Amino acid sequence: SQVFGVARIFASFNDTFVHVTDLSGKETIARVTGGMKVKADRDESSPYAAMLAAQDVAAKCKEVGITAVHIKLRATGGTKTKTPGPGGQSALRALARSGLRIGRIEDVTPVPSXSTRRKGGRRGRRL
């Protein structure tokens, strides 16, 4: 029926990676980040640049034959935050509005089963 790809979205608090792969994920089709769309470091994770990255990969998907995508949304994970960054919401929305078809949605944030000593120290970062 449709041509299922896999859109693996990385939504941190400093950047947003929109990475469209095959079902295995061993083959990369498109990968455009927030910093490829803006010239300032501060708005690389901004939802504005997130849709721009999401629109470019969507155009990349059609021209190679991709018609539908599975969504692998995740945060930084590990010992760091588990909530997705701001760029994940607008990029997926733009992917929905870019003519692509959406399949499954799942959050694949890597979660430790305990963990290593998280950076910052005992007293954390004091601002």
Q: CB-wise, 65 or 122, nearer to RNA? A: 122
Give the residues across from 106 on adjacent strands.
72
* Closest distance of CB 14 from other proteins, Å: 16
Q: What is the enclosing helix (H) or strand (E) of 23?
A: none
Member of 14, 62, 104, 112 binding other proteins (CB under 8 A) = 104
Site string for RNA, 31-50 (x = CB under 7 A): x-x-----------------
**Count of alpha carbons within 13 angstroms of residue 107, beta-carbon side:** 12
Q: CB-wise, 1 or 115, nearer to RNA? A: 115
CB 86 within 8 A of CB 122: no
